[PDB]
Amino acid sequence: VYRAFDIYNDKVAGFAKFLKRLTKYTMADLVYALRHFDEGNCDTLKEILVTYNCCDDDYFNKKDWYDFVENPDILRVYANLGERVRQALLKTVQFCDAMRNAGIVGVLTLDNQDLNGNWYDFGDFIQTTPGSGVPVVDSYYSLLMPILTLTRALTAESHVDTDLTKPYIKWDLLKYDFTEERLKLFDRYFKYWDQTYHPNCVNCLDDRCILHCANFNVLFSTVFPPTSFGPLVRKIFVDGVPFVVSTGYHFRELGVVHNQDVNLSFKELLVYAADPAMHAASGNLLLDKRTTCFSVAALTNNVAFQTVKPGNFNKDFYDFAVSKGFFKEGSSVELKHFFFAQDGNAAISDYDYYRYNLPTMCDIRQLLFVVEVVDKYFDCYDGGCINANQVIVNNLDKSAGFPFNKWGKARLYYDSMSYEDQDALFAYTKRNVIPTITQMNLKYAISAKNRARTVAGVSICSTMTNRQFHQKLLKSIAATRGATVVIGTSKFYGGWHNMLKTVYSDVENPHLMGWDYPKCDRAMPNMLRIMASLVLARKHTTCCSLSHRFYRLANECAQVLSEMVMCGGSLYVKPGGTSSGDATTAYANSVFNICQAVTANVNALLSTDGNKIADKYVRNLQHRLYECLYRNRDVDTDFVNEFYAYLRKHFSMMILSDDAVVCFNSTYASQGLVASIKNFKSVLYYQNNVFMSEAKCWTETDLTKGPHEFCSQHTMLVKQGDDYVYLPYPDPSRILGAGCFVDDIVKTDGTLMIERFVSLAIDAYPLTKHPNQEYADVFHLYLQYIRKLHDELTDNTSRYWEPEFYEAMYTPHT
């Protein structure tokens, strides 16, 4: 029968299904089932769950028994296995000790350990002098890592004497330095993981060491009480009056970090006010039973409830549209996009969606190789730190965060500080940690679903320092055309056609596909966000030292990843995820997307049988992929280049931060040499902790039709100028709703509507070439409406309502 095996021989190498007291299943079957997840074939996973009392078959009769978001109770069922996993870990160490006490050198594989933890393997072992045996546990531990936090194997470390029956451990409420406990945890479970582990990531040597140590800390921080993590504060004496200020931080992933300018000016006042220390110290204690998210304090005398009012309605546009034959029964274009009003509990209920963010431990060897490959997608860009006078800021009339929104906009702070002050602040952030407070606001815009959208407004210190750190690389990425990341590449003036031709380039049997990330902004693991920041910061090999770059990374971690979130006047802690109002949200999201695609490709190429691969080049590439993944500690630039070229040939990606189009050789994917939809589903299941459904991910066989959807835009091949070009058109219901339903009533009368409708007629011109007469009539509706508004208002103006205007913006001349 099919069993999961991890093999590394002279002919085949991978982690794949092969045809082949002692339990029915082994640990590798558990790891394979939880990693390569397919809801169609869950028989091994169901048998494993039922056999070991995690649940019963009646649990599977319900729908969505596997989904994390829809059925959070599954997180308990998986956790009901975690203790078993923990026992395995302990037994593993014992086994290793025995080998080291018998002078045996061997490679430990998952398939040799049954689900009770026993090891029934004694082959592949080379005898040596007793006492000098060196177990090899890179593959075993590295593959088992994602199961350690999925099943919560380290819960029993929170109890006295490690007994699940005994009560919790009463750690001192004042304790913050858990370094000795982290050493004990590492030496108890990962005793033979040879790479040096630094509980405080200040001691880390480079980016890869930071990733490795932070990966271990993420697992080890689930044991300790959640009240210890967060800013560390100390009483200082400013001019004799006792302040309390943050002189450090405690990161779930980076350990304890201590400021270097601890001393006991407008910059120093900003560092004090942005600090949540004073606010969370003078505020009243708060216990919010509405959310399971940890709460800190209440900054006001009452809890605030914010209601989203319903959107306005354009009677004129609706009347004109129904006078033109729209919105009839059985038609194709309707009103499907509305302003959905919300009640007072909307903000906190949407903040509660962070319960989907779980502590995720990543496959560290796989993540290191994947970050090596992902860095290749950003080598055609240059970046570095810049001075304050080189920083470009788009809008200076935006909020400055909290508490800075009380006194003015960001323009006031940029005018107050001289360039020397901003440079001094940036240099301060290179040596110290400055925790900030980010507000959550409710968004007010057209949407097709009743759910509300929350935006995380960040403070001004984070914005300024992150701009100075990242703007050169950001503008480099936003001004490069023809690369994987298409941020900054307009879809106008033949942009969409050039993008599509770039994606189609040199693929033997090209099919297209696409997917989406469910709850991307909330369910993202923290390790992937750290990796994205490290990839963005790799462009500082000469301007910043190691310590400066680490303290900058700690700054993003403390101001974006785990900052204090002020909702309704109350301070909560953010478990993780991303801040949608961050400076580098789109680019870190693009790095995360490329990471997930590369991980899918690696899993697809490694889970192939290998023996049945008829291509010798692909078989050798798979063998060297396993070698460079779980056998080589230092980077292999040659094979990274080779795998990057292999992907760029057989997997062409078009990425905008969440929305991706992949043109792939269909023969290779059907053979199992390239990622498919099921590989992405498995990858998002075992890393992103979310289930991806086939309804929201699509495939396309004929390139002429083009991508089904990209950036909420369909595409179509048309003829103009004797040339077949790809034009993007939107869903006409979206445009009709935008016309009918307005954000504010002022945009119901005046000149403003004209411009608005122009920018809606520009985006609805391609619908003219659609075969459906309703879609084509949408455009003429908009043009007749613009003409009617212009007539009501009453040579240079007639050019707004002629089709030549909107035709000229899809010809690639300009």
Next chain:
Amino acid sequence: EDKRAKVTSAMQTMLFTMLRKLDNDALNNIINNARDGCVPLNIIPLTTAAKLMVVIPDYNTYKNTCDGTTFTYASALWEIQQVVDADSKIVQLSEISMDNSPNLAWPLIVTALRA
């Protein structure tokens, strides 16, 4: 420069006035309990704040957490001073019951003082 002076003055005033609200009676003791003098931020509200606010979404949570006039939280004994609903109106303790729960405008914000 005048705007810079105004912003600095406002920030200093906010820090000073809010430092007036900051109590050193238990802060000194909890700092002294720390050998290095550094304490987590999340611990200061638990051990130093006098007033506590609890937000109750449903009657089940109310009877589970703060049913009596004096309840416990953070290993401390708190006595209820006021109860308000989401409309910012006073709600008496006798009004909160399973029979009258459908008539109340949940959630309820209950304010207590440390005893």
Next chain:
Amino acid sequence: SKMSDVKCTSVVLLSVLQQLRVESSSKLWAQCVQLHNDILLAKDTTEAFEKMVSLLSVLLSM
């Protein structure tokens, strides 16, 4: 038709209810929001008219 116009009228009535200081009351505004969001998301005309009548009654109570 009969669906689009009832959805538009539900939107305008929720807007005028909000202008009538209904959002001060938590329960009344929550009920109005639920009715309006179920009307807009509805695909059946019978449910649309039923919730439309209920929302209009909420408006007419004052």
Next chain:
RNA sequence: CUACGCAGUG
């Protein structure tokens, strides 16, 4: 090119 407004996208 710099300012302000609008629209679209994540």
Next chain:
RNA sequence: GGCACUGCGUAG
């Protein structure tokens, strides 16, 4: 009453 990108429109 947030970040980024793109495209309009009025001004030197």
